[PDB]
Design a protein around this ligand. Structure first.
Ligand code: XMM
Ligand code: XMM
Ligand code: XMM
Ligand code: XMM
Ligand code: CA
Ligand code: CA
Ligand code: CA
Ligand code: CA
Ligand code: K
Ligand code: K
Ligand code: MN
Ligand code: MN
Ligand code: MN
Ligand code: MN
Lengths: 232, 232, 232, 232
């Protein structure tokens, strides 16, 4: 099984497996049952931004989601990712639908990693090309004619579909820790557009970090957000 | 009085005003009496590195000090700087000597600030020029023919003197918060060389953030590290 | 007099002092009489982008102007800025109106300098605050409640006025060369909105580099773009 | 055959295939016969630095090599790499020995690419790990116990070998151009240590950019620097 760390923008409350009964942002450490969550005041049809950060000295993974003009929502969890993740990871975005549905559109994605022992990786996309050779598209993930990343299946009409799962990983492995290292830190930002006709959209989007050979686990659809085999 | 946030590398224990009884790294919020400290295994004569980071979501100010070879020391404190600091600041280094003394040599200094409402400021110095027009030098601070910044008095011969105070501020004010801000972060690194003829070197170095019109408070000498008017 | 290097977006042809007979992008070295120009297909009412770059090895200063959609214009000039500019500079934007007029609105501005002997300065503004303490505003320059920088007078109603000059300099001086330097580079981007009620808008916008104590030369109005004391 | 653009630090004069009769730096466009060169004042046993830059507006690929304290050497060539290279490339370093020999030690390597239509890639290594998962090592290339990259074969004693070729490519494809794009630019820096017992060291080191599936061509040893099948 993959080792997974994620920040979930969770649109659909699955109260039977630990979600609060509201759209929430959460921090997931090796389980879909977030270690910490916060009410997300969703706005179907607006562009949202997530920013995510961690460093190995503070040991505090935190995330904020916002929309232009709105109040933002934040969540944090104290954790030493050196004891959770392996030294080398791939970083990526995931998204699912299930019985309910939404567009999982990513308009932009940037990521920075630093390791001082200074080694660094940084990448930033404001367009996605039709053939993103520096992305590993998994599942139903694809790029569109506006240079956006659609993680889950959609018509060119506009209409999203159910039982869809797609991810996008940065092609290059990332070195997030080492024995020598004094500090390791990463920061990630993405902007996203969730539209739905459904009164109750589902399921959500994820930024995540995993072992390098990470793949969509089977039965990780809908509420497991493409990350987890089961809901332990 | 100035408003001060600082990370202090305090080479000299002043137990009568709250220092632990050993050299330590501290986080100072509006007082010399550090809110959080950790033991610092000084290595007079060797080049040390300090990394400092904060962001407004995690609300944790952290610092780590390290020498090439040995293990390193960290210190953290949970604080919302938006309730401590004005919206515009200057950032700087300070150092002092009192009755006991040491060189307070800065070999390099970098700083990055970000404000997402993205606005940003990054500066990096590896070589300090003979006339650093982008620094405000206060007190005894000067740059030397090696391209280092000496915060405290050092003779023609290279011997440190007591009763010295100096500071260097980046010339441009930094926007560290604003109302409509989603997240504010900053990171700082400097490297430093402390040499002493005294069996107990003193008094230390700080990275500090302050009101833009900050100046050396009179009687901030020695154990108050060029930051504070008294020891309250 | 000041020493000026500038990239001019010159909306108004002043053929009597060397402008070509159309709107143009120019590179100005110590004179309003551009050393190199190219035709600029203005689109009053649309958001334009300018990118400028130089480095001391290639010795080529280049600029490109672009609107989303249409094709773009470029201009270059081979010059060793180390023989033109002092070692320390300020960097800024200027704009003017004369008898004819336009809005000279800056929506964003970024600048990166590097000096390898690495020393560097990066600043980026997407939103200009109501009180930009890291800018020196000269002349009619001001920031507005949209978070834009208006270089020239614009009424309560949003109508531009003639006989306006304004400039904005980054507060910190920039080290663009030193003896022991291997390479010096700089890059600048700004975005801009020019609206005009006049059939011939005027006079234009510049990005400029100058002596640190640069100020608006009297009679630099209109066609001299807030940079030059005369048209020599 | 690969499409190759390179900057060669050429230690061994092969006058029969277009080299000047001296150690030189050159710019190679689809042939080992540099389009432009300049005398390199080699210093076997000192750390050298190369910096390389290009942008699509200026159309000037330039490189500078230097050592601490020395005079630097520079070379440039005007070229539009959009008409030479494909949209997607891998970037890398190469090195050979032949009958004569030298260490081809890389101590550091950084690279930045930007594409404005802003998309960007940046990576920086000051150590190389024992298993660099974000590098594609080709030929004899390997990382060592000091976290340096040895492009060509060496004893742990110190002693280099002949008939050696190795390269190192960044794992992620890089997008250096697109139809939409206004500007594309890249910058690269590496530091290097060439030691030799030979009175006449050979052959040299390269930074290069190629089609993504680039591989060491057979018979590209010694003077062809791992890049080219023949000396056309
Ligand atoms: O997309 C929303 C949800 O739809 C599915 O489950 C249900 C939500 N309401 C239901 C009603 C009936 C049945 Br059967 C099912 Cl599986 C569900 C599953 O795909 C869930 O994992 C998913 O979170
Ligand atoms: O430089 C180290 C310290 O030396 C001075 O105080 C003393 C340290 N040991 C002493 C012994 C005697 C006397 Br009097 C004094 Cl003031 C001190 C003062 O300058 C202190 O502020 C400073 O921290
Ligand atoms: O704003 C455009 C131009 O208007 C002014 O000059 C003239 C442009 N057309 C004219 C017609 C008549 C007279 Br008088 C004048 Cl000064 C001008 C002057 O302010 C020029 O410097 C400026 O470039
Ligand atoms: O490493 C230096 C050079 O050594 C080889 O060629 C010769 C240099 N001097 C010689 C003398 C004899 C013979 Br045979 C050869 Cl191939 C050479 C070849 O491997 C060249 O490609 C290479 O540049
Ligand atoms: Ca859910
Ligand atoms: Ca003390
Ligand atoms: Ca004009
Ligand atoms: Ca050769
Ligand atoms: K969890
Ligand atoms: K060539
Ligand atoms: Mn959830
Ligand atoms: Mn203390
Ligand atoms: Mn002109
Ligand atoms: Mn050659």
């Amino acid at each position: 099984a993959d080792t997974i760390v994620a920040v979930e923008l969770d649109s659909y409350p699955n109260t039977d497996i630990g979600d609060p009964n509201y759209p929430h942002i959460g921090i997931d450490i090796k389980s879909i049952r977030s270690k910490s969550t916060a009410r997300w005041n969703m706005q179907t049809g607006k562009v949202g931004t997530v920013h995510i950060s961690y460093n190995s000295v503070a040991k505090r993974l935190s995330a904020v989601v916002s929309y232009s003009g709105s109040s933002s929502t934040t969540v944090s969890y104290d954790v030493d990712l050196n004891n959770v993740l392996p030294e080398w990871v791939r970083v990526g975005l995931s998204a699912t639908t299930g019985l309910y549905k939404e567009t999982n559109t990513i308009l932009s994605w940037s990521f920075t990693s630093k390791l001082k022992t200074e080694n660094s990786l940084h990448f930033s996309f404001h367009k996605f090309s039709q053939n993103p050779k520096d992305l590993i598209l998994q599942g139903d993930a694809f790029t569109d004619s506006d240079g956006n990343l659609q993680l889950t299946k959609v018509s060119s009409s506009g209409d999203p579909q159910g039982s869809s799962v797609g991810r996008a990983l940065f092609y290059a492995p990332v070195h997030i820790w080492e024995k020598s290292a004094v500090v390791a830190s990463f920061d990630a930002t993405f902007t996203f557009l969730i539209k739905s006709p459904d009164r109750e959209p589902a399921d959500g989007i994820t930024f995540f970090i995993a072992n390098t050979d990470t793949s969509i686990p089977s039965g990780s659809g809908g509420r497991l957000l493409g990350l987890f085999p089961d809901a332990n």
